[PDB]
Amino acid sequence: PWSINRDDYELQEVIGSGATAVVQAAYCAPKKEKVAIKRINLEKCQTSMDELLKEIQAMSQCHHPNIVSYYTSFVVKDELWLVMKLLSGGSVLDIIKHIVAKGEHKSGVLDESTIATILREVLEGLEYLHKNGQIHRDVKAGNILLGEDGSVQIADFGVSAFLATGGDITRNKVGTPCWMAPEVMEQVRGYDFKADIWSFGITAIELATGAAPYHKYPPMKVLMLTLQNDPPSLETKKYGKSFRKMISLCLQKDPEKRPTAAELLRHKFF
Amino acid sequence: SALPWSINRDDYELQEVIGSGATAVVQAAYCAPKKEKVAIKRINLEKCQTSMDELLKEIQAMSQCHHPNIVSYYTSFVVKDELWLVMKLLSGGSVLDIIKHIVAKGEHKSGVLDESTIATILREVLEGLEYLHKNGQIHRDVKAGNILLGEDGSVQIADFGVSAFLATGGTFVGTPCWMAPEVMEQVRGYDFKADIWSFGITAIELATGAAPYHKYPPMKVLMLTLQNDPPSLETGVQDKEMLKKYGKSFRKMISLCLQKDPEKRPTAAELLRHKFFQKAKNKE
Amino acid sequence: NRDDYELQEVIGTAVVQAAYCEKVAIKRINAMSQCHHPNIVSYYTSFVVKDELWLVMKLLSGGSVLDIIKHIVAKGEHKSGVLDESTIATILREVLEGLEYLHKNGQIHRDVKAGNILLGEDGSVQIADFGVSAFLAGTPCWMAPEVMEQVRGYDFKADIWSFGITAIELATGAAPYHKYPPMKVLMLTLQNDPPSLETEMLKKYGKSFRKMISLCLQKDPEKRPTAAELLRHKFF
Amino acid sequence: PWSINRDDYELQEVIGSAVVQAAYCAPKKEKVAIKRINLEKCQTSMDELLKEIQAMSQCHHPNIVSYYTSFVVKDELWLVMKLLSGGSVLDIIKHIVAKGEHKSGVLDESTIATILREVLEGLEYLHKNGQIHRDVKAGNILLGEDGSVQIADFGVSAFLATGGDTPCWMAPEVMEQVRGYDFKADIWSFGITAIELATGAAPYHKYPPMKVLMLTLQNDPPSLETGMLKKYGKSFRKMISLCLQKDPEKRPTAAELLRHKFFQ
Ligand SMILES: Nc1ncnc2c1ncn2[C@@H]1O[C@H](COP(=O)(O)OP(=O)(O)NP(=O)(O)O)[C@@H](O)[C@H]1O
Ligand SMILES: Nc1ncnc2c1ncn2[C@@H]1O[C@H](COP(=O)(O)OP(=O)(O)NP(=O)(O)O)[C@@H](O)[C@H]1O
Ligand SMILES: Nc1ncnc2c1ncn2[C@@H]1O[C@H](COP(=O)(O)OP(=O)(O)NP(=O)(O)O)[C@@H](O)[C@H]1O
Ligand SMILES: Nc1ncnc2c1ncn2[C@@H]1O[C@H](COP(=O)(O)OP(=O)(O)NP(=O)(O)O)[C@@H](O)[C@H]1O
Ligand SMILES: [Au+]
Ligand SMILES: [Au+]
Ligand SMILES: [Au+]
Ligand SMILES: [Au+]
Ligand SMILES: [Au+]
Ligand SMILES: [Au+]
Ligand SMILES: [Au+]
Ligand SMILES: [Au+]
Ligand SMILES: [Au+]
Ligand SMILES: [Au+]
Ligand SMILES: [Au+]
Ligand SMILES: [Mg+2]
Ligand SMILES: [Mg+2]
Ligand SMILES: [Mg+2]
């Protein structure tokens, strides 16, 4: 019962403006609620509504306290508008960016108890998604949103994560495959939920160091450093405990070796 | 008097022009034999792409439908190339005059007319439409511009018949299994329930100052109304938060009227029993 | 110089305490500062104790302008605006004369806001001390704009912007983008029309006030007026 | 079950101020809330509090903050109870008032109905057991992490916040004082907290406490007494007026109130 009439939403301040998406605040009159709208130019992102069908459907079905509330979606001219809850506390990345700008980071960005609190809620959000056979695909500090009540939710499940990570290449998208290399098999099959576990590990480093391990390198070098070398760590301070052990479990090259969200939801760190 | 009302042109002395419209002109006139100052709507038959033959059924209804909440129609006759509709001159102006007055003052953004005032005006409109519908008639053009007020505070619906007919214009070819929805909708027609929708839009107009899609050209408003779910109070409005003043009883009254399926819409008699119309006060 | 100072109530980048000799405020810190003006909180003296730098300044028992705003906002009298246009004009003229003096001495306040507009028992208006914040102070044709920003830095015109935001604050009760995280306000400022009194029936404020605000809140600092040019504005 | 030994409780952060402090209970494994009460300061002893403590042990209801155990630590009485992480309803109110979004009202009418129904069901349980809460207010409505609504401070806390203490020609007030007040006192309190959720504060919040006592006895308050709030209508104001009758006999029971239009 969320309106798909464009004239029921009063567009207000633009929150974000990137190449793929603009995030704009809007007042929805029938629901008397100030909401967030992610506007996506379909032609610019080389995509279509038919291509995003099952993504939108998954967004319509996956609801959890630790996932940003999705309301509805509709087409306005050449854009798809995704209507969701506006979270007034901002992103965890915003907090990280504030600590660095203040110069309160050269001994660690977020406290270990602060990291444990945020990541547990993120992991419970992922646990729900994985239970429903879904993958988030774009876990990062920028996609962890905070409510003014202190709640922690993952943003960008569905369409947004889909367009940021190669499109329809997961398990949700031969012959005699006995001679196929493992990487060929993975392309036929599609990658699984364990991709989220790796991204979670990088996010853990991000909350502590203030950045992803290879942040300074161009995209192609980041990809080459990740594939040619052993998995990264905090070193690339006041952390050395189960936190590093927890990170090393996530950051394993073989996705099979990585733990599930539920198995990870244990561990002494949390 | 009397009488009755004269069909001779020389018996009427033209006076002040009230509205110089794009189709018709409303001019005050004095009727000598009746010793009464009346209102005459002058409709150029050529300009409105019409003749007397198609207007005869409308005039017939106009001469029969007489009710406290319907502007008193007196008579009609042809003067050269135009039809003169003689009616009672009302001194209070229209509800649109009130709206325009508040919109010009800049006191409209948080609402134009309060709920008590709206309830008072529209319940009288409902009594008028109830009368028309029971007589098997449809107004077809209910809007603030067609709600005239008397000096004493009486509320009367204007332009029933010819004017409403002309303002709104006024399964076949092809094979049904292949026909587009909009082709098939042509033979569906409409009844008195069409007035109930228009009444709901009029409710919004008294609150906001305008109809939902007033900012768009005529072809676009057709498109947007037919394409989208029914409009609500803040649909098409610039500053939507500022209309939070209007309560839920008014909003549920509106949503009763504004349903795509006319069979789901209440009758005028049903609407008169709604909670919102208890806010009606003395007539000014 | 020495104390000679009776440690009293806490008011109160560490703490600020009231002290007797006579009503005086001292600020504890974890050189000059020659500025002296009725519209600026300046230091009488500065001396050391034990890992702390004491800064003696005039005690203002009238609180801040934000205190007045917070009382109004806590009540229901911010329906048609917070502070009256006449009260805003009086308070901000004093602040602007304080900024004019600072800028003429090559100084920048760096933190103008209602919380830093302190009020005296006298009814005096002055901007809070800025000395401690002030302590943390080729051929560019081929430079990227993001490189240019660091090289160009900022000057006194930054105070003029903050002054404009403070004008909105006294009328509305808050800075335009108060509901968003601190590190988001840059993006919110740039990706939207220059902040205004509206960025809702809370406005009985005239065009002259809105005009004054718009002058201050121009993205390019060069287009912003000087404090002296602002003092000439019709609003004041 | 729950240990009466201090050693088994590890004191942590202070929640609020009697002082409320969080503590971890190692046997079993649960972070609990412990209220610490200085006996002499409130001019109270264990002897006068025993009847209050035994009632706390007996009461067991989803809408009542779960009381675990009590024990004396030196000159302090420790009340061990469930820790609720959602805070109080007063905290939510205070936040909305501070940012001035209490214009047109504080809590939504639907939100007030849901919260107060749970409170009223909590009160119904207490009254069924012949008990009186004595201190129903928004600050004593605590929220659970699972969205639960629970009444806090039954027994010792509400008792100490309120205090330890031929009729033919006798005045009605005097008769009331000899008999003592009953459960209908909670119903009035309930009506005051309903105004608190809608306006942000009690009806006489302006005037200083103690003067509000004199003002109450001289008048009779509605929602309008605090200070626009037109979104609250019909059955809500009627519900309040039923609670806020001067004659306690004319106030409805909690069970009668749960049948009111405002609470399907
Ligand atoms: N629901 C929301 N509520 C509040 N803020 C949001 C919400 N969704 C997104 N944002 C913010 O809007 C801005 C832009 O969002 P987004 O388009 O996801 O940029 P991003 O995080 O850089 N992702 P990407 O552009 O794909 O790299 C960011 O500051 C987000 O934190
Ligand atoms: N019987 C009447 N008594 C007094 N005023 C009238 C009467 N009939 C019409 N008017 C006024 O005459 C003016 C013009 O009337 P009309 O020709 O209906 O124009 P309109 O209402 O603007 N319709 P339109 O010109 O097609 O947009 C309006 O201001 C009416 O209020
Ligand atoms: N001269 C003064 N007279 C009276 N009060 C003062 C004076 N100077 C500072 N204060 C108050 O001292 C308190 C703390 O001051 P300060 O050390 O500047 O931190 P602050 O005002 O909170 N600034 P910030 O830490 O950046 O938010 C504030 O409430 C000031 O209003
Ligand atoms: N079991 C609990 N779990 C979580 N918080 C609690 C619990 N009990 C009390 N609190 C909080 O402790 C703080 C102070 O408690 P209290 O001493 O009861 O003050 P209060 O809220 O004014 N109640 P009262 O003093 O009885 O009127 C309040 O913010 C309560 O919300
Ligand atoms: Au794109
Ligand atoms: Au799903
Ligand atoms: Au094979
Ligand atoms: Au015509
Ligand atoms: Au008729
Ligand atoms: Au057919
Ligand atoms: Au200086
Ligand atoms: Au150059
Ligand atoms: Au106590
Ligand atoms: Au009991
Ligand atoms: Au007797
Ligand atoms: Mg994002
Ligand atoms: Mg008309
Ligand atoms: Mg309490």
CA–CA separation, D34 vs D78, rounded Å?
6
Pocket test for ligand 3, best of C8, C15, C16 (most atoms within 8 A of CB): C16
Q: Are strands D19-25 and D9-16 parallel, antiparallel or unpaired?
A: antiparallel
Q: C-alpha angle with apex D70: D67 to D71, nearest 5 degrees?
A: 165
Count interface pairs B-C at CB distance under 8 A.
7
Contact C58, C41 (CB under 8 A): yes
Pick the closest to residue B70 from B276, B253, B206, B268 (CA basis): B268
CA–CA separation, D132 vs B160, rounded Å?
68
| Resolution limit, Å | 2.2
Instruction: Please count the other Cβ atoms lying within 10 Å of the Cβ belonging to residue A222.
Output: 15
To 10 degrees, what angle do helices C207-216 and C157-172 make? 140
Q: If DSSP states are collapsed to H, E and C, what string results for D142-206?
A: EECCCCCEEECCCCHHHHHHHCCCCCCCCCHHHHHHHHCCCCHHHHHHHHHHHHHHHHCCCCCCC
CA–CA separation, D187 vs C80, rounded Å?
38
Contact D88, C66 (CB under 8 A): no
> Tokens 């198995």 label which residue?
A263
**β-bridge partners, A40:** A21, A80
CA–CA separation, A230 vs A252, rounded Å?
9
**β-bridge partners, A26:** A11, A35
Pick the closest to residue B72 from B85, B87, B62, B91 (CA basis): B87
Count interface pairs B-D at CB distance under 8 A.
5
Q: If DSSP states are collapsed to H, E and C, what string results for B115-139?
A: HHHHHHHHHHHHHHHHHHHHCCCCC
The pocket of ion ligand 7, defined by CB under 5 A, consists of A 176, 178
Q: If DSSP states are collapsed to H, E and C, what string results for C111-168?
A: CCCHHHEEECCCCCEEECCCHHHHHCCCCCCCCCHHHHHHHHCCCCHHHHHHHHHHHH
- Do residue A32 and residue B244 have CB atoms under 8 angstroms apart? yes
CA–CA separation, C229 vs B119, rounded Å?
54
The residue among C79, C80, C199, C201 with the most chain B CBs within 10 A of its CB, best to mutate, is: C201
Pick the closest to residue C87 from C129, C38, C123 (CA basis): C123
Report residue A248: phi and psi, to 5°.
-65, -25
CA–CA separation, C79 vs C202, rounded Å?
6
Tokens of C206: 């005239």
Tokens of D258: 């749960």
Contact C88, C167 (CB under 8 A): yes
Q: Is B231 exposed, middle or buried (0-12, 13-18, 19+ CB in 10 A)?
A: buried
**B149 CB within 6 A, ligand 2:** no
Chain breaks in chain B (C to N over 2.5 A) after: 170
Q: Which chains touch C (3 or more CB pairs under 8 A)?
A: A, B, D
Q: Is C218 exposed, middle or buried (0-12, 13-18, 19+ CB in 10 A)?
A: middle
CB contact set of C124 (below 8 Å; sequence gap of 6+): C38, C60, C62, C94
Contact C116, C64 (CB under 8 A): yes
Q: Is the dihedral of CA A111, A114, A118, A123 positive or negative?
A: positive
Q: Is C7 exposed, middle or buried (0-12, 13-18, 19+ CB in 10 A)?
A: exposed
Active-site positions of A read 138
Chain B residues touching residue D233 (CB < 8 angstroms): 247
Pick the closest to residue A9 from A54, A98, A76 (CA basis): A76
Contact D52, D77 (CB under 8 A): no
Cα separation values, D101 from C79, C204, D95, D116, D199, Å? 11, 20, 9, 21, 11
CA–CA separation, D67 vs B132, rounded Å?
69
> Could you tell me the domains of chain D?
1-83 (3.30.200.20), 84-264 (1.10.510.10)
Q: If DSSP states are collapsed to H, E and C, what string results for A161-206?
A: HHHHCCCCCECCCCCCHHHCCHHHHHHHHCECCHHHHHHHHHHHHH
Q: Which atom of ligand 2 is nearest to the CA of B96?
A: 31
CA–CA separation, C51 vs C29, rounded Å?
8
Contact B6, B75 (CB under 8 A): yes
DSSP D13: E
Q: Is D174 exposed, middle or buried (0-12, 13-18, 19+ CB in 10 A)?
A: exposed
- Do residue D104 and residue B247 have CB atoms under 8 angstroms apart? no
CA–CA separation, D45 vs D41, rounded Å?
10
Q: C-alpha angle with apex A208: A205 to A209, nearest 5 degrees?
A: 80
Q: Which atom of ligand 2 is nearest to the CA of B146?
A: 21
CB contact set of C222 (below 8 Å; sequence gap of 6+): C157
- Chain B closest-CA separation from residue A73 CA (Å): 14
- Do residue A10 and residue B238 have CB atoms under 8 angstroms apart? yes
The pocket of ion ligand 18, defined by CB under 5 A, consists of D 140, 153
CB contact set of D93 (below 8 Å; sequence gap of 6+): D106, D107, D138, D196, D197, D200
| Approach to solving | X-ray
Contact B85, B158 (CB under 8 A): no
**C64 CB within 6 A, ligand 3:** yes
CA–CA separation, D109 vs D115, rounded Å?
10
Report residue A98: phi and psi, to 5°.
-75, -40
Q: Which chains touch A (3 or more CB pairs under 8 A)?
A: B, C
CA–CA separation, D5 vs D10, rounded Å?
11
Contact C65, C91 (CB under 8 A): yes
Measured in Å, residue C31 CA sits from the centre of ligand 11 at 11
Contact D117, D258 (CB under 8 A): yes
Measured in Å, residue B56 CA sits from the centre of ligand 13 at 89
Secondary structure (3-state) at A12: strand
CA–CA separation, D36 vs D74, rounded Å?
11
- Chain C closest-CA separation from residue A230 CA (Å): 34
CA–CA separation, B230 vs B255, rounded Å?
8
Report residue C102: phi and psi, to 5°.
-60, -45
**β-bridge partners, D81:** D33, D67
Report residue A2: phi and psi, to 5°.
-70, 130
**β-bridge partners, D65:** none
Distance of CA D182 to the CA centre of its chain: 15
Pick the closest to residue D231 from D107, D96, D94 (CA basis): D107
The pocket of ion ligand 5, defined by CB under 5 A, consists of A 20, 44-45
Q: Is B82 exposed, middle or buried (0-12, 13-18, 19+ CB in 10 A)?
A: middle
Q: If DSSP states are collapsed to H, E and C, what string results for chain B?
A: CCCCCCCCHHHEEEEEEEEECCCEEEEEEEECCCCEEEEEEEEECCCCCCCHHHHHHHHHHHCCCCCCCECCEEEEEEECCEEEEEEECCCCCEHHHHHHHHHHHCCCCCCCCCHHHHHHHHHHHHHHHHHHHHCCCCCCCCCHHHEEECCCCCEEECCCCHHHHHHCCCCCCCCHHHCCHHHHHHHCCCCCHHHHHHHHHHHHHHHHCCCCCCCCCHHHHHHHHHHCCCCCCCCCCCCCHHHCCCCHHHHHHHHHHCCCCCCCCCCHHHHCCCHHHHHCCCCC
Cα separation values, B30 from B1, B34, B89, B149, D247, Å? 13, 9, 10, 20, 70
Chain B residues touching residue A8 (CB < 8 angstroms): 232, 234-235
> Tokens 């110069």 label which residue?
A103
Ligand-binding site membership of B22 (annotated): yes
CA–CA separation, C223 vs A47, rounded Å?
43
CB contact set of A206 (below 8 Å; sequence gap of 6+): A93, A96, A140, A141, A212
Tokens of C60: 């203002």
Pick the closest to residue B115 from B275, B271, B241, B273 (CA basis): B275
CA–CA separation, D147 vs D63, rounded Å?
11
Q: Is D217 exposed, middle or buried (0-12, 13-18, 19+ CB in 10 A)?
A: exposed
**β-bridge partners, A170:** A191
**C112 CB within 6 A, ligand 3:** no
DSSP code string of C167-219: HHHHHHSS-TTTTS-GGGHHHHHHTSS---TT--------HHHHHHHHHH--S
Gyration radius from chain D CA atoms: 19
In terms of phi and psi (left: phi > 0; alpha: psi -120 to 50; beta: otherwise), the region of D104 is: left
Tokens of C77: 């009298």
**C53 CB within 6 A, ligand 3:** no
Contact A13, C199 (CB under 8 A): yes
**B144 CB within 6 A, ligand 2:** no
Beta-carbon-side half-sphere exposure of residue A252 (alpha carbons within 13 Å): 14
Tokens of D246: 């001067």
Secondary structure (3-state) at C3: coil
Contact A242, A234 (CB under 8 A): no
Cα separation values, B71 from B63, B90, B94, B140, D197, Å? 12, 8, 12, 15, 51
CB contact set of B155 (below 8 Å; sequence gap of 6+): B69, B120, B121, B124, B125, B128, B147, B148, B149, B283
**A164 CB within 6 A, ligand 1:** yes
Query: Which secondary structure element, helix H or strand E, spans residue C68, and what is its range?
Result: helix C65-74
Pick the closest to residue A201 from A231, A229, A162 (CA basis): A231
Sheet strand arrangement including D67-73: D9-16, D19-25, D30-38, D76-82, D67-73
Tokens of B60: 């017939």
CA–CA separation, B249 vs B277, rounded Å?
9
Tokens of C11: 């008011």
DSSP C8: E
- Do residue D227 and residue C74 have CB atoms under 8 angstroms apart? no
Measured in Å, residue D255 CA sits from the centre of ligand 16 at 50
- Do residue D103 and residue C73 have CB atoms under 8 angstroms apart? no
C12: preceding bond cis by omega (within 30 degrees): yes
- The CA-to-CA distance between both ends of chain D, in Å, stands at 39
Measured in Å, residue B109 CA sits from the centre of ligand 17 at 25
Q: Which ligand is nearest to the CA of B61?
A: 9
Compute, in degrees rounded to 10, the torsion defined by CA atoms A212, A218, A221, A222.
Answer: 20
Query: Which secondary structure element, helix H or strand E, spans residue D67, and what is its range?
Result: strand D67-73
CA–CA separation, A32 vs B241, rounded Å?
8
Pick the closest to residue A119 from A231, A240, A264 (CA basis): A264
Tokens of B211: 């109809």
**C69 CB within 6 A, ligand 3:** no
Tell me which of D8, D47, D91, D135 is the catalytic residue: D135
CA–CA separation, B137 vs B134, rounded Å?
7
> Tokens 């005045």 label which residue?
D171
CA–CA separation, D215 vs C60, rounded Å?
37
Q: C-alpha angle with apex C134: C133 to C137, nearest 5 degrees?
A: 110
Contact A158, A183 (CB under 8 A): no
CB contact set of D189 (below 8 Å; sequence gap of 6+): D133, D134, D135, D136, D137
**β-bridge partners, B77:** B84
Sheet strand arrangement including B36-44: B12-20, B24-31, B36-44, B82-88, B73-79
Contact C62, C121 (CB under 8 A): yes
Q: C-alpha angle with apex D81: D80 to D84, nearest 5 degrees?
A: 140
- Chain D closest-CA separation from residue C8 CA (Å): 25
Contact A162, A47 (CB under 8 A): no
Amino acid residing at B265: R
Tokens of A58: 């998954």
In sequence order, which ranges of chain D are alpha helices (DSSP H)?
A: 46-58, 89-98, 109-128, 156-162, 172-179, 184-199, 211-218, 235-243, 254-257
Pick the closest to residue A16 from A96, A94, A75 (CA basis): A94
* Residue with CA closest to ligand 4 atom 21: D139
